[PDB]
Each structure stands twice: as C-alpha cells, then as structure tokens.
Tab-separated table of C-alpha atoms (C1' of nucleotides) and ligand atoms in Angstrom:
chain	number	residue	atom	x	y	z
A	1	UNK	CA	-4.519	-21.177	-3.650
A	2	UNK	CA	-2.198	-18.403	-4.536
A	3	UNK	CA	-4.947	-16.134	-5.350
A	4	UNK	CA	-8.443	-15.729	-7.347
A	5	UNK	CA	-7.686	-17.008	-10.790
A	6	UNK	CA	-4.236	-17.675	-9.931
A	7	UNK	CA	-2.256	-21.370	-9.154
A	8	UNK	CA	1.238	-22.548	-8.912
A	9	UNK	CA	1.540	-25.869	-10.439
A	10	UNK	CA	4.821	-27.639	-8.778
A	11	UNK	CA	7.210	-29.052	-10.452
A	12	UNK	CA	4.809	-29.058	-13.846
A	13	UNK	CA	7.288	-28.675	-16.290
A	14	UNK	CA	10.243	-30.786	-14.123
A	15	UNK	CA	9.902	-33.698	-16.865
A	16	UNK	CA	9.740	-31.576	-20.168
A	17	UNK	CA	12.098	-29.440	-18.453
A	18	UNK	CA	15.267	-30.790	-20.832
A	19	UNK	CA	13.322	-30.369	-24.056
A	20	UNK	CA	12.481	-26.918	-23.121
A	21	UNK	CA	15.802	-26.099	-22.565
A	22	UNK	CA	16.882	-27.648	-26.023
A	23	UNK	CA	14.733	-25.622	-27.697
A	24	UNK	CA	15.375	-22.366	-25.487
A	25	UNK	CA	18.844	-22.778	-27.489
A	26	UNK	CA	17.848	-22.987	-30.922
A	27	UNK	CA	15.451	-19.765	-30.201
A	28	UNK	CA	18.561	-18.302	-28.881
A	29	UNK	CA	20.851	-19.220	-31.638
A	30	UNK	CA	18.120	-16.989	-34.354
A	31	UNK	CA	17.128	-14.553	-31.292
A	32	UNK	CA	19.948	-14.210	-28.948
A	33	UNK	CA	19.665	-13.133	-25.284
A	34	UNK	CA	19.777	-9.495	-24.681
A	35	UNK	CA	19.999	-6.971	-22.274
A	36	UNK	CA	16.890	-4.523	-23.269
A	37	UNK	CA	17.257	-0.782	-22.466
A	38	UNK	CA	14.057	0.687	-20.270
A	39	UNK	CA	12.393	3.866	-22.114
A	40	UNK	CA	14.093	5.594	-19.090
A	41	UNK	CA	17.540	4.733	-20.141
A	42	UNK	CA	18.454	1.956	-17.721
A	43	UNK	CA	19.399	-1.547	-18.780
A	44	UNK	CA	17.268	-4.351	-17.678
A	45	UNK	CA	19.273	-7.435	-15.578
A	46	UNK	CA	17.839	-9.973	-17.201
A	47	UNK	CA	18.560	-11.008	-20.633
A	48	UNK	CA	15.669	-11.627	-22.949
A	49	UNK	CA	14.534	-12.974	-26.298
A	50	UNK	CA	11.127	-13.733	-27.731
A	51	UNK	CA	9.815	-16.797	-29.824
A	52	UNK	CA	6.299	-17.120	-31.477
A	53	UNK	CA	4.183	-14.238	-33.510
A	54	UNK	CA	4.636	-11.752	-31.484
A	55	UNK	CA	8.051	-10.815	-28.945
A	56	UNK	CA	7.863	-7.790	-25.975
A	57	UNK	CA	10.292	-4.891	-26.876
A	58	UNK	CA	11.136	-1.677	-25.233
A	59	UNK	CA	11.102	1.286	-27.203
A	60	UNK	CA	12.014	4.889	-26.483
A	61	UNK	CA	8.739	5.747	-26.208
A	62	UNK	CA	7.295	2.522	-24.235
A	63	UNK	CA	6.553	-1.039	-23.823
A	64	UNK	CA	4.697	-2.939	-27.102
A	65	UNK	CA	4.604	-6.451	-28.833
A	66	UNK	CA	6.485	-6.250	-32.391
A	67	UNK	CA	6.348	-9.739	-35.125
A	68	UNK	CA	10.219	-8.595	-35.946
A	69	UNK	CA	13.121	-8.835	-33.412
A	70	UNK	CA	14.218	-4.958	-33.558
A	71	UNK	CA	17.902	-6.490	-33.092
A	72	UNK	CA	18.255	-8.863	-36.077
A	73	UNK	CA	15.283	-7.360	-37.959
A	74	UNK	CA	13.731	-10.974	-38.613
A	75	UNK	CA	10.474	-12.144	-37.653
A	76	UNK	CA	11.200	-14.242	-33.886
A	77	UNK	CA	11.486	-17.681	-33.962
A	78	UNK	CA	8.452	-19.986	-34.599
A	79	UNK	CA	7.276	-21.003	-31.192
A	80	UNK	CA	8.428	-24.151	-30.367
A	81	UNK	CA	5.767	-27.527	-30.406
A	82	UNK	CA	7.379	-28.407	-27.090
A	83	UNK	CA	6.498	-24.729	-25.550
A	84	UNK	CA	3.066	-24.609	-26.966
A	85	UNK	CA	2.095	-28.332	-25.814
A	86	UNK	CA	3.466	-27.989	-22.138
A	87	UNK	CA	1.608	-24.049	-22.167
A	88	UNK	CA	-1.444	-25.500	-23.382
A	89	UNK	CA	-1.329	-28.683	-20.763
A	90	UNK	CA	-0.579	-26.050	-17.698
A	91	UNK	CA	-3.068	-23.610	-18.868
A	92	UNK	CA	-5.594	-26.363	-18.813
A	93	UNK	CA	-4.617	-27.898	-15.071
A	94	UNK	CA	-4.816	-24.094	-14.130
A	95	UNK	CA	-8.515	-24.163	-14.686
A	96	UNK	CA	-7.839	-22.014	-18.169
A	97	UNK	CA	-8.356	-24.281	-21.475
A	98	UNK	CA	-9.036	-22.398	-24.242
A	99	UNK	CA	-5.713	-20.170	-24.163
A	100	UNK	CA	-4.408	-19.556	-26.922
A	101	UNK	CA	-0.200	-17.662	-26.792
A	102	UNK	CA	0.954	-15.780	-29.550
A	103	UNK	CA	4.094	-14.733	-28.067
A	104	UNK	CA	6.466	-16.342	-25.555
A	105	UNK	CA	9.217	-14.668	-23.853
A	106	UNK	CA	12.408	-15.974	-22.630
A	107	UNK	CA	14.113	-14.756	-19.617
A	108	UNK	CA	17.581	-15.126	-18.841
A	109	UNK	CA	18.653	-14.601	-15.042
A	110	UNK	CA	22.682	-14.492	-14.107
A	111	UNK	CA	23.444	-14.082	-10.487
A	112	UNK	CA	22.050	-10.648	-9.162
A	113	UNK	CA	19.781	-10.368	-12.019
A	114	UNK	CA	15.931	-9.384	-11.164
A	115	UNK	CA	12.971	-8.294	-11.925
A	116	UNK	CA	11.131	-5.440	-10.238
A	117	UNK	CA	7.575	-5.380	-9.612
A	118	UNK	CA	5.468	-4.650	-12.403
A	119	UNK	CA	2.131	-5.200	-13.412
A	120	UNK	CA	2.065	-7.398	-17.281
A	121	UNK	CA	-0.553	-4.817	-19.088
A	122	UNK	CA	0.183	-4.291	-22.622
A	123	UNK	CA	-2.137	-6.515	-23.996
A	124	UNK	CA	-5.143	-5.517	-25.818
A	125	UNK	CA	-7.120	-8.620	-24.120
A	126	UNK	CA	-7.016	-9.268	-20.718
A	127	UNK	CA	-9.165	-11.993	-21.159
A	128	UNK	CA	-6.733	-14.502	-21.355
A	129	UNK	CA	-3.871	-15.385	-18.735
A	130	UNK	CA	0.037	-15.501	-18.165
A	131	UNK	CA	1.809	-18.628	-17.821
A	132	UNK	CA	5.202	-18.526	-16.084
A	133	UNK	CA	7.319	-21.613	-15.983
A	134	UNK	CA	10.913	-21.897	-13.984
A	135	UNK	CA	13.840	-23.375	-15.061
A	136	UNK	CA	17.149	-23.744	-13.621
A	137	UNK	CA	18.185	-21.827	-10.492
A	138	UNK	CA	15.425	-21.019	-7.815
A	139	UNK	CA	14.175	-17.658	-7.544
A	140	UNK	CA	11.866	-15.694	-4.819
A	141	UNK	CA	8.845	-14.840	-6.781
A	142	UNK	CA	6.613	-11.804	-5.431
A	143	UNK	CA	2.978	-11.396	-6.197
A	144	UNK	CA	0.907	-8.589	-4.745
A	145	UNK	CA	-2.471	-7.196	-5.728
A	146	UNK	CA	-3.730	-4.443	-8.003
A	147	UNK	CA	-1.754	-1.836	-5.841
A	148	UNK	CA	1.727	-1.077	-6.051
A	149	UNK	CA	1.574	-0.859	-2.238
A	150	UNK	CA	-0.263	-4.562	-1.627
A	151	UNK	CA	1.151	-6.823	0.712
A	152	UNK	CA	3.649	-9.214	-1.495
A	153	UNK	CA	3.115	-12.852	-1.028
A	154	UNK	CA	7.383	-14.424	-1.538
A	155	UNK	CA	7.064	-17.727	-3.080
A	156	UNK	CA	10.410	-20.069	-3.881
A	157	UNK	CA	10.002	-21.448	-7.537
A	158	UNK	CA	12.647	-24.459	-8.657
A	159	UNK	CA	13.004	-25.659	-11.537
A	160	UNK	CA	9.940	-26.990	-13.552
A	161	UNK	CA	7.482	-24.878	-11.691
A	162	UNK	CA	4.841	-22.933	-13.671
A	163	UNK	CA	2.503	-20.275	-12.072
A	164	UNK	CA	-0.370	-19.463	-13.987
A	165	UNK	CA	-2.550	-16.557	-13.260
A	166	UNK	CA	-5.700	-14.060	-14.848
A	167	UNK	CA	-9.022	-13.312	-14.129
A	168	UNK	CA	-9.455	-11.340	-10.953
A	169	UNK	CA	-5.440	-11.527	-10.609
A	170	UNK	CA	-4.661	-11.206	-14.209
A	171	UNK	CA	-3.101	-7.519	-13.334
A	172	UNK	CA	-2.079	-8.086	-9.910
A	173	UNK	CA	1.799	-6.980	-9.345
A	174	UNK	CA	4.500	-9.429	-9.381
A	175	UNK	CA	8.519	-9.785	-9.970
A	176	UNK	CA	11.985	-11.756	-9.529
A	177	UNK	CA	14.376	-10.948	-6.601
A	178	UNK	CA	18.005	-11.014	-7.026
A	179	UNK	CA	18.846	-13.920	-8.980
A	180	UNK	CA	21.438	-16.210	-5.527
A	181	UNK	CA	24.483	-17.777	-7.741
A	182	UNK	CA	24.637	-21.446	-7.274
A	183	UNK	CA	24.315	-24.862	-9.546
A	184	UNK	CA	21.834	-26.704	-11.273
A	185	UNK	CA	22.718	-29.590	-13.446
A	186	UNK	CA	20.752	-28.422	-16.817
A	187	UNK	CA	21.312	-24.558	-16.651
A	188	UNK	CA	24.752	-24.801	-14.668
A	189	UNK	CA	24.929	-20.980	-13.665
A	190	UNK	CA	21.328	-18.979	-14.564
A	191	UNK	CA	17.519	-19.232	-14.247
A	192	UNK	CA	15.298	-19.811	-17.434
A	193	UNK	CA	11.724	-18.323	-17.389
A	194	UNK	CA	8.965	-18.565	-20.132
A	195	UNK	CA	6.258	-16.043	-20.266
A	196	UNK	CA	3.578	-16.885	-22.452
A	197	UNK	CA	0.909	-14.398	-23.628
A	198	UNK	CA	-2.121	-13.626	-25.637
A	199	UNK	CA	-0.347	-10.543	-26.886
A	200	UNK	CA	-2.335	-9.513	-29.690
A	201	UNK	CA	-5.657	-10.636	-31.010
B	1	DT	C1'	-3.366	23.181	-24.898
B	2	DA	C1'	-3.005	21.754	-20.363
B	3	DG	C1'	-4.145	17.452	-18.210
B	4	DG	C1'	-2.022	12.791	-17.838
B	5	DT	C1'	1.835	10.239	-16.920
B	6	DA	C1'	6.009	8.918	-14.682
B	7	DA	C1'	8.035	2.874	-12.271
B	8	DA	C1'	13.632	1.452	-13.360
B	9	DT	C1'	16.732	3.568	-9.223
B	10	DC	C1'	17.238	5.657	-4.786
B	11	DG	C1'	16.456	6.565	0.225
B	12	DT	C1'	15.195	4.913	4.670
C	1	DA	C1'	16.747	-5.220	3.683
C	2	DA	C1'	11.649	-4.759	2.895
C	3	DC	C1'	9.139	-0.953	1.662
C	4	DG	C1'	7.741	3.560	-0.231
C	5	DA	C1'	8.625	7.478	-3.310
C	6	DT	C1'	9.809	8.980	-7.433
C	7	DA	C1'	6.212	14.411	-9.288
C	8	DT	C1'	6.648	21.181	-3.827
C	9	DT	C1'	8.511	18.173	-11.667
C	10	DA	C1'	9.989	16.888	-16.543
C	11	DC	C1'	8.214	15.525	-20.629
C	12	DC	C1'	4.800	14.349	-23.734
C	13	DT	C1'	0.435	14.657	-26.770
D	1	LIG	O1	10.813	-14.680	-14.378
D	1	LIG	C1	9.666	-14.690	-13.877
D	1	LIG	O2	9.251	-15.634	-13.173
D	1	LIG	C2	8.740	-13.511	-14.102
D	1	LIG	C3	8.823	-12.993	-15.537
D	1	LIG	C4	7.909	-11.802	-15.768
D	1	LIG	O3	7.107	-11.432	-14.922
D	1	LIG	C5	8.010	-11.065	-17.025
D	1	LIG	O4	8.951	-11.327	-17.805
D	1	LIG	O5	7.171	-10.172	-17.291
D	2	LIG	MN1	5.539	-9.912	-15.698
DNA sequence: TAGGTAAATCGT
DNA sequence: AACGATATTACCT
C-alpha cells in the first residue's frame, strides 16, 4: 500500500477518462484556467479552476475556499454528475464510502509546470479524504510524511489513475514534478488533475 | 504587544 | 538534481 489510509487505484478513471475531459471543458468555458498568484507574489505553474460549492483561491493574505470565482465573480460551476459519480466510486474502492466533495479543483499542467510539496490543510474537517485523479500526460508524484523533511516516495501516475488518501496520511506532504512535454491522444500537450475535497462543512 | 509565522524560490 | 533552508528576519495580529 502507498501508506496508512492511503491507495493508488490504477488506471481507475482510464474508462470515464473522455467524459471527464468533456466536462473539464465546459467548467473551463464558465471558469477558465488560470495562473493563481501565491500570497508571496509568485505565480503558480499550473493553471487552475474550480467546479462545485466551493473552489481554492489564493489571496494576499492566504490560502481559503470561496463559493464565487474571484476572477469572473460568479459562483463556480456546478460539479459535474460525471466527477461526483467516478469520486464517489474511487472513494469507496479506497476503503472511504461516505465522502462527501464540495469542491473540486482542476489542474492544468503545460510542460515544466509543477507542483511543490505542500501539505492540503485548509479544511475545517480533516475527517474526510483527498481524491486525486490523472489525466493526460504522466507525471512523478511525491508523497512524504507529516515532515517537510520525510523521505519522498516518487510514484509515475498515467492517465486515469486516482490516488486517494486521509486518515493517518490525510496531511502527509505531497506534489507534481516538472510536468516532461510529450503526447497523449485526449489531452494532446498537458496533464489534467482533479482534486476533490470536503472543503467546508 | 510580542509571540507566531514564513514555504514559493534559491543554494548546494 | 535531490534535498534542505528560507528566519543571526520581515511582517502580521
Ligand atoms: O496534480 C496532482 O496530482 C496533485 C494536485 C494537488 O496536490 C493539489 O492541487 O493540491
Ligand atoms: Mn495537494
């Protein structure tokens, strides 16, 4: 297993994969993709947007969950029934069946893009986990502990895998490395990732 | 107030 | 390039 209260499920998501991306469009077309700007001043690589009640936004003054999209000022996009039933059916396989998201975000990796490690703690309950699924272009994926400094496990995930994890490694450390260019038939030239949460509650 | 918080980039 | 430091400091509440 990856870890205590943590699983990858291979390849889950490989036959819903081009309905997701369908509907990662028409979120995109209400929400686009955006580069968000770090409370420090530096612009994240990836490009983001948010569907469901509740989207993650930076703010001068931190990291929190907002209903409106801070970009168009509307409320993000309704989650889509083909996001929540594949979330719900890998949350379940993952040993966690009574998650409930409220937020789902979209990541959007070009070549070079990546995520540095960071623990996902902005959420009032911890109870509940984080499901990750891959689409597109394969990434290295690094999960740690509840150190900064813990050794990194560096797992490959291709497209349709989902990682779920919580409980005793609902905090543990984890990011993206640098986005390699290359092909995939469905995505072409980037790497989709959907992060669903519990964010509020 | 004065204790807590810095976490993406930079250096090795 | 895989790690550690960032604070022997600035910026807040
Ligand atoms: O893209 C991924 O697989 C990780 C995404 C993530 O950790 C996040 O957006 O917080
Ligand atoms: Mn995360």
């Amino acid at each position: 297993p990856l870890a205590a209260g943590a699983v990858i499920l291979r390849r889950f998501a490989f036959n819903a994969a081009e309905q997701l991306i369908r509907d990662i469009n028409d979120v995109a077309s209400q929400s686009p993709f955006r580069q968000m700007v770090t409370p420090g001043g530096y612009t994240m690589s990836v490009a983001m947007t948010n569907c469901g009640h509740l989207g993650w936004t930076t703010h001068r003054q931190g990291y929190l969950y907002s209903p409106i999209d801070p970009q168009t000022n509307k409320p993000w996009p309704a989650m889509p029934q083909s996001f929540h039933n594949l979330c719900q059916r890998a949350a379940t396989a993952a040993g966690y069946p009574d998650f409930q998201p409220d937020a789902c975000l979209i990541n959007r990796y070009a070549p070079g893009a990546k995520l540095s490690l960071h623990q996902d703690k902005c959420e009032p309950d911890l109870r509940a986990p984080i499901v990750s699924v891959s689409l597109g272009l394969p990434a290295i994926f690094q999960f740690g502990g509840l150190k900064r400094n813990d050794p990194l496990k560096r797992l490959l995930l291709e497209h349709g895998d989902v990682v779920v994890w919580g409980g005793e490694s609902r905090l543990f450390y984890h990011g993206i490395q640098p986005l390699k260019a290359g092909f995939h038939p469905l995505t072409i030239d980037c790497r989709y990732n959907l992060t669903f949460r519990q964010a509020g509650k």
